[PDB]
Design an enzyme around this catalytic site. Structure first.
Site, PDB file in Angstrom:
ATOM      1  N   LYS A  54       0.369  14.608   1.071  1.00  0.00           N
ATOM      2  CA  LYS A  54      -1.002  14.934   0.659  1.00  0.00           C
ATOM      3  C   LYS A  54      -1.206  16.430   0.313  1.00  0.00           C
ATOM      4  O   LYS A  54      -2.235  16.796  -0.312  1.00  0.00           O
ATOM      5  CB  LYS A  54      -1.988  14.486   1.703  1.00  0.00           C
ATOM      6  N   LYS A  99     -15.150   8.007  -2.925  1.00  0.00           N
ATOM      7  CA  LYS A  99     -16.351   8.359  -2.183  1.00  0.00           C
ATOM      8  C   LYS A  99     -16.929   9.667  -2.675  1.00  0.00           C
ATOM      9  O   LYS A  99     -18.151   9.855  -2.730  1.00  0.00           O
ATOM     10  CB  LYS A  99     -16.021   8.503  -0.673  1.00  0.00           C
ATOM     11  N   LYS A 157      -8.760  14.010   4.929  1.00  0.00           N
ATOM     12  CA  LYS A 157      -7.820  12.895   4.860  1.00  0.00           C
ATOM     13  C   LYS A 157      -6.791  13.186   5.951  1.00  0.00           C
ATOM     14  O   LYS A 157      -6.690  14.299   6.480  1.00  0.00           O
ATOM     15  CB  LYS A 157      -7.113  12.780   3.492  1.00  0.00           C
ATOM     16  N   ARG A 158      -6.004  12.176   6.291  1.00  0.00           N
ATOM     17  CA  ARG A 158      -4.968  12.386   7.265  1.00  0.00           C
ATOM     18  C   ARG A 158      -4.002  13.522   6.836  1.00  0.00           C
ATOM     19  O   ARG A 158      -3.704  13.712   5.627  1.00  0.00           O
ATOM     20  CB  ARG A 158      -4.182  11.095   7.509  1.00  0.00           C
ATOM     21  N   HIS A 199       0.777  -1.228   0.000  1.00  0.00           N
ATOM     22  CA  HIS A 199       0.000   0.000   0.000  1.00  0.00           C
ATOM     23  C   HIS A 199       0.817   1.292   0.000  1.00  0.00           C
ATOM     24  O   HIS A 199       0.263   2.343   0.244  1.00  0.00           O
ATOM     25  CB  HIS A 199      -0.932   0.047   1.197  1.00  0.00           C
ATOM     26  N   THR A 216      -8.787   6.423  -1.532  1.00  0.00           N
ATOM     27  CA  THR A 216     -10.175   5.951  -1.545  1.00  0.00           C
ATOM     28  C   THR A 216     -11.197   7.033  -1.225  1.00  0.00           C
ATOM     29  O   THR A 216     -12.348   6.971  -1.709  1.00  0.00           O
ATOM     30  CB  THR A 216     -10.408   4.750  -0.593  1.00  0.00           C
TER      31      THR A 216
END
Ligand SMILES: OC[C@H]1O[C@@H](c2nnc(-c3ccc(C(F)(F)F)cc3)[nH]2)[C@H](O)[C@@H](O)[C@@H]1O
Ligand SMILES: OC[C@H]1O[C@@H](c2nnc(-c3ccc(C(F)(F)F)cc3)[nH]2)[C@H](O)[C@@H](O)[C@@H]1O
Ligand SMILES: O=c1[nH]cnc2c1ncn2[C@@H]1O[C@@H](COP(=O)(O)O)[C@@H](O)[C@H]1O
Ligand SMILES: O=c1[nH]cnc2c1ncn2[C@@H]1O[C@@H](COP(=O)(O)O)[C@@H](O)[C@H]1O
Ligand SMILES: *Cc1c(COP(=O)(O)O)cnc(C)c1O
Ligand SMILES: *Cc1c(COP(=O)(O)O)cnc(C)c1O
Lengths: 810, 810
Positions: free
Chosen positions: B548, B654, B542-543, B351, B650
């Protein structure tokens, strides 16, 4: 099957079967193809529990509406044992559950054996609290038991190589279907911090908080539809506790360790910080709950009309200064009014006079942990001593003796003195014990406030300790006098009219015989041990302590062994001598006594000359569920503490109710038992209290008994020389040394009278009809020892409430 | 009310009402006069749970009888969220429970909000495991999820003074009605010890034992009556553990700390002993259960025909050497046969490619904790490198690169290398990620065994992430195309025929508007914050991680602010920019990014010239239940990781399913999303992977972007000079310093393209009909991203089993 177990109606049996199958499927998530006996037990427990809940809700709703005076019984120990059978007895469901399970292909007695004891106490004190809850419910009192939900109760005892080993009693592993967590009524408890004085009074600040989460257990009364609550507190850390990150979460255990484990000492004080935290934790959470319930009915003058707090020994003594803290610091009452309310609310029960058992906390501990409480205790002390000085002016030594603060190397607080000063009633637990309190250790207090001092002789519940454990005896009694005795035990006096009845004599002896067979078989299955059920079953079960004198019993067993070896072909009445009980883990001499008992067994039980005439068995892991098995099977109850040491005893009473004769000293409640039965129907021996005092004045010299009694000298020489420990010949030298030079309990001084009295026991046992007649005279006069009697006296003489035998509607 | 929520039949509603009242009374022991909303929630949860149990028992009985191949999904994380609504959806009970509760005077939506998330994961990886369980059940696979029952899941995030604070997530406080403890299937797990070599093989001796107690949770499939199991292990000490006495009992916490807390890092490796214990604990207990179930059907050749083990990243990698240990040391298989069985049984999913996320355990830790496993790992390594040397002879550098053992200051084991060697399949989680694995970090392995390497693009369950969270959208879709799409999401392609339908366009826009109003009100009630629901809702949740690029979003927000301040009277499309997510507790830069976001909000939200045109909100405590609320309300989804860093994503999927447009880089699954929708229907910007590589070769110089882009230079000068932190002017200097000199994620290099692409977003939003048309084109092509598709591919291409949409009988 038997009448006292209730009706097994078709509708009831049908419904129990349905609900059992419903719990197996929905609650347990099992089908019958893989269900084990433990799954069957849980399915039954849930089925029975469902019958409690409507009654529990309705009882609590009734107390909310009628607003009676509420009784709060505060204890660090509740030794409850198993719940399933007691529930069924008190709801009249036993025969119906038996039939339901029978129709499902199951044996209910086998299911009952799966349940774990709730072992949240050490012995007598904890078990008295449990009997008391049962009696309070049976008498319709609005009573609550408050304690701590220990994750680990009294340790499981294993014997390895003849020595006690301890294992953790992980009693919650499979779950506890009897409790209901109430996380919604969680309350904060404060520790450490410091006191600041404002213009507006003292403020306790910068404290550490631990949460108290309650778990409630129902307490059913006997066939009256009353269900009271036992509320036990569990420790939880707050979510911001310690809040690198991982370590802070793991450190929550520091807070949660408060409720982790029961301190396993009986009659001994260990002044450890964790124990003090436990004591405050239970008191602080309980007192908030009490006040909440009082406010939901400003005016604290009515508090003592609506609340009674009974302190089970000094263990919850911090209730006194906590109540004062709340009233003065938080509710803003003046000191004198707060004190008046406190004294009228609180009452204290003393359970021991041994000095090493009394709680005396170092001031430095209280100063760090509970600084505001220490300030309040000092103020109580100064005000109390001001009263002493006004009543006995110039008596400076009395001021020192009565102070709550003991001077010394380390200053300590005497918690018993605090309880007396702060309580409107102080009681002992048997008549001789209450007299000793007034003449010796609390003499000064008695002279100051004589009205405070009372007696409340202990008792046992006849639900658990007759109906549940000895249904055969309960039934034969009921056949003659009906069932009303189960809640009015004085009715057993009617059995005196049967003492010459041949059929009754036969039936009493038959029940004892059945109980002995059933116990002898239990022993074979669970412990690979082979006893003669025709032998006299001579039983001493209780915690191991020097004051209880298991050692004196040991000396008698050896004496019998030596007599057999000397005249092997002479007849002697066969005995099975059974001794059991736990030793506190740090109590070295108690652990050595266990080893001596097993070592005696290793010699006696394997000597072919002895044969089946003498067997010595150490009963492992003595606990409430073992007591329920062995007590009905006993012939001879050993109650042989040195006069003046056993405050009451309660094992004694259980044996009396179950058809054993007693060999005992005139100590604790044994005195009252002999008075009720007649001294002719009791095997009394040994020094009285007055004789012990006379010996202490002259000085006890054990060597004099050794020099004068050749049988005794032989036993000591065998112990010293390695006869009972051939691989380690010096193994018992600490026991020998103690007996000869430092025995506080005067074992040798009662030896001769004890052996002679034991010969009288043997003589009577040879005549079974006369033995059984004497048994009937004991059972018949055991009524005084019902805890229903005890509780009615507390209610009337201390709490100011009237018991009721009236039913709530079902 | 709405069709997709099922029927509310009179009989069903009547029965639910009865069972609710029965649980309130019997289970909860409350009457309606003092029941709280939380009691009502529990009564409903127990009522719904009862409908699962028959199906659960029957499903498990069916697998016992048919003996299909069993799939074991091993994960350290299962991010389940709430269970009540998902259960009702999957059993078709939602409308009936709504009506039942409505008739009892209760609002079911209010009851649903009382349930705690089960937060047993960090983010994407844990939530993928949860979607996968739902899909496996829906596809009729005999699948088990195995993990750890953490007492504390991912921490609750509070923001204080703009900074993250952590509090423990005590999710079990009120109890978990969904799990069933199974203390009867408790198993031992061994640690420490040493290895002895006998004539009969190696023996692992003198170990410390911890017990693994399982708790089972049901996993319902979608309307197929299948209920699979998630089995989570809890750590317990044995009763003789450490067995002065009090301390030994308290020290049981050392063993029980294994299951206490979830490590809260996302995409970062911390090599701590406790984490290694967790990893072995889950593997050792799980493997015993697997073998037990295999034997209850000698012959291990059939093992891989009956068992598949899927490793969710390297976290359960010790399954490989544990399986070998069991087979070789305990079952006495020869090494080569054991290895064959192991490789055919195990498969590994990777991952991440970030090097700091890869597990590399120091040899000294394994040597102490798991000495036999280290021996086995060394033997695997030598045999594996022997194969490498035979295939690439003389290539010594390849031998060093491929070794499981990394040389250095500290020798480490590379667990990813172990997983590749020991697995028959290795997959990445999106097409670009799987390609990167074959070209870069696992290139050498791919050359050796090309057949092993696969792709399985991630997905999300459309039960939780459409039907449950966005019933309004689900319903308008169902009105047109029926309900079959809920378990066959490719059917959404039929919506392309509506893209010019005026009524459908109106209804899509109406649902979004309702969702925005409902979210804007949630914000006001629970967080005292006032947003314009007509504004474009621009959402990045998100984290918090540098890769990110929440910082890139921050630079855009400041740019917009500065543009307004420069031309305050020019029209701009109003935005509400919402950013949320947790930072790992030790990740300093992530915590600083949170503070910057809140500080930007403090300036922007209070500037009267801005008005309602720009609002910046930090969404506190982002978690699964918050995602269910904010995702349906979003207009713009921010998926802006540097190309090559986000293995899949992911959240992206969504948002697509729920009617947001995406602004994103060509990273992870964003690539496939744009391919499915068409690039014209996606807002793509920034460097591709190839461009990032080209910049790394030249050398990234952030100063060049600062020197050339005046708008960017202004923002940096504002950050440095204290504009966003006037009391602490140097507060952001670590952020500035990182951006200018040590930015591994090239924030400045995508700035210009990002701002330009954001202007195109704003332009489209001004034309609501065309915006909504583009939304329909995204929803319509989102079918590929169903986790049902993902799982069918694993089943066919990895596990060798066929999915089924067939119902078990009800
Ligand atoms: O009244 C109930 C019974 O109480 C017994 C009794 N007295 N003190 C105790 C007792 C129990 C535990 C602890 C401790 F250590 F704190 F845990 C301290 C003291 N137990 C008497 O020995 C016993 O004689 C009496 O019948
Ligand atoms: O495949 C599911 C998701 O996995 C995410 C993902 N990758 N590695 C992780 C991850 C999570 C926790 C831990 C740790 F530290 F051990 F707890 C280490 C690594 N999470 C990807 O970033 C994300 O891109 C992907 O969609
Ligand atoms: O405000 C109230 N209304 C009605 N009944 C109450 C109220 N407060 C307490 N009770 C009743 O008494 C309670 C017993 O709980 P306690 O307050 O913990 O003693 C409840 O179970 C109710 O039956
Ligand atoms: O010996 C057996 N007889 C009948 N059913 C069994 C037996 N062993 C397992 N099962 C079935 O399968 C089980 C599922 O449990 P597991 O072994 O934990 O997977 C049980 O719930 C039974 O329904
Ligand atoms: C009754 C009882 C006791 C108290 O017995 P004494 O002989 O009075 O000390 C101790 N333990 C258990 C398990 C009991 O049932
Ligand atoms: C889906 C989800 C994630 C993963 O989001 P990404 O944007 O793919 O990182 C993280 N946390 C929660 C609560 C989620 O629901």
């Amino acid at each position: 099957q038997i009448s006292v177990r209730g009706l097994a109606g078709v509708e009831n049996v049908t419904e129990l079967k349905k609900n059992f199958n419903r719990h197996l499927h929905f609650t347990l998530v099992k089908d019958r193809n893989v269900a084990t006996p433990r799954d069957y037990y849980f399915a039954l427990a849930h089925t029975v529990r469902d019958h409690l809940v409507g009654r529990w809700i309705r009882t609590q709703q009734h107390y909310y509406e009628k607003d009676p005076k509420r009784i709060y019984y505060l204890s660090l120990e509740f030794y409850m044992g198993r719940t399933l059978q007691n529930t069924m007895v008190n709801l009249a469901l036993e025969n119906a559950c038996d039939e339901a399970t029978y129709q499902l292909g199951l044996d209910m007695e086998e299911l009952e054996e799966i349940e774990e004891d709730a072992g949240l106490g050490n012995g007598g004190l904890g078990r008295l609290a449990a009997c008391f809850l049962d009696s309070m419910a049976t008498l319709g009192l609005a009573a609550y038991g408050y304690g701590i939900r220990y994750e680990f109760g009294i340790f499981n005892q294993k014997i390895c190589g003849g020595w006690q080993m301890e294992e953790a009693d992980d009693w919650l592993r499979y779950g506890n279907p009897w409790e209901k967590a109430r996380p919604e009524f969680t309350l904060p408890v404060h520790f450490y911090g410091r006191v600041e004085h404002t213009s507006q009074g003292a403020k306790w600040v910068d404290t550490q908080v631990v949460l108290a989460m309650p778990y409630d257990t129902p307490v059913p009364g006997y066939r009256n539809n009353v269900v009271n609550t036992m509320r036990l507190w569990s420790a939880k850390a707050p979510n911001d506790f310690n809040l690198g990150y991982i370590q802070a979460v793991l450190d929550r255990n520091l807070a949660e360790n408060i409720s982790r484990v029961l301190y396993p000492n009986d009659n001994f004080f260990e002044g450890k910080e964790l124990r003090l935290k436990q004591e405050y934790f239970v008191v602080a959470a309980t007192l908030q709950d009490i006040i909440r319930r009082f406010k939901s009915s400003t005016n604290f003058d009515a508090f003592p009309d609506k609340v009674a707090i009974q302190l089970n020994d000094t263990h919850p003594s911090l209730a006194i200064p906590e109540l004062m803290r709340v009233l003065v610091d938080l509710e803003r009452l003046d000191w004198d009014k707060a004190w008046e309310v406190t004294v009228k609310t609180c009452a204290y029960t003393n359970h021991t006079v041994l000095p090493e058992a009394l709680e005396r906390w170092p001031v430095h501990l209280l100063e760090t942990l509970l600084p505001r409480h220490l300030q309040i205790i000092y103020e109580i002390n100064q005000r109390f001593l001001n009263r002493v000085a006004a009543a006995f002016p110039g008596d400076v030594d009395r001021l020192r003796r009565m102070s709550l603060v003991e001077e010394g190397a380390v200053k300590r607080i005497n918690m018993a003195h605090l309880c007396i000063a702060g309580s409107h009633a102080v009681n002992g637990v048997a008549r001789i014990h209450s007299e000793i309190l007034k003449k010796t250790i609390f003499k000064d207090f008695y002279e100051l406030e004589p009205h405070k001092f009372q007696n409340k002789t202990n008792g046992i519940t006849p639900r658990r300790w007759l109906v549940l454990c000895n249904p055969g005896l309960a039934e034969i009694i009921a056949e003659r006098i009906g069932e009303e005795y189960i809640s009015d035990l004085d009715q057993l006096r009617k059995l005196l009219s049967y003492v010459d009845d041949e059929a009754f004599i036969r039936d009493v002896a038959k029940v004892k015989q059945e109980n002995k067979l059933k116990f002898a078989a239990y022993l074979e299955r669970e412990y690979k041990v082979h006893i003669n059920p025709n032998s006299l079953f001579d039983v001493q079960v209780k915690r191991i302590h020097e004051y209880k004198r298991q050692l004196l019993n040991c000396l008698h067993v050896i004496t019998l062994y030596n007599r057999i070896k000397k005249e092997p072909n002479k007849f002697v009445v066969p005995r099975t001598v059974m001794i059991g009980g736990k030793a506190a883990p740090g109590y070295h001499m108690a652990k050595m006594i266990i080893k001596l008992i097993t070592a005696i067994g290793d010699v006696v039980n394997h000597d072919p000359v002895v044969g089946d005439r003498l067997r010595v068995i150490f009963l492992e892991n003595y606990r409430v569920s073992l007591a329920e098995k062995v007590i009905p099977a006993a012939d001879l109850s050993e109650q042989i503490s040195t006069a003046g040491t056993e405050a009451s005893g309660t094992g004694n009473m259980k044996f009396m109710l179950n058809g054993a004769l007693t060999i005992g000293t005139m100590d604790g409640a044994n005195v009252e038992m002999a008075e009720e039965a007649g001294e002719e129907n009791f095997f009394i021996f040994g020094m009285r209290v007055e004789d012990v005092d006379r010996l202490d004045q002259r000085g006890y010299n054990a060597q004099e008994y050794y020099d004068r009694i050749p049988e005794l000298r032989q036993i000591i020489e065998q112990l010293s020389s390695g006869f009972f420990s051939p691989k380690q010949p010096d193994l018992f030298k600490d026991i020998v040394n103690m007996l000869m030079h430092h025995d506080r309990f005067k074992v040798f001084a009662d030896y001769e009278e004890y052996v002679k009295c034991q010969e009288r026991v043997s003589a009577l046992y040879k005549n079974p009809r006369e033995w059984t007649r004497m048994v009937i005279r004991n059972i018949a006069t055991s009524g005084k020892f019902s805890s229903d009697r005890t509780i009615a006296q507390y209610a009337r003489e201390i709490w100011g409430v009237e018991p009721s035998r009236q039913r709530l509607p079902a």
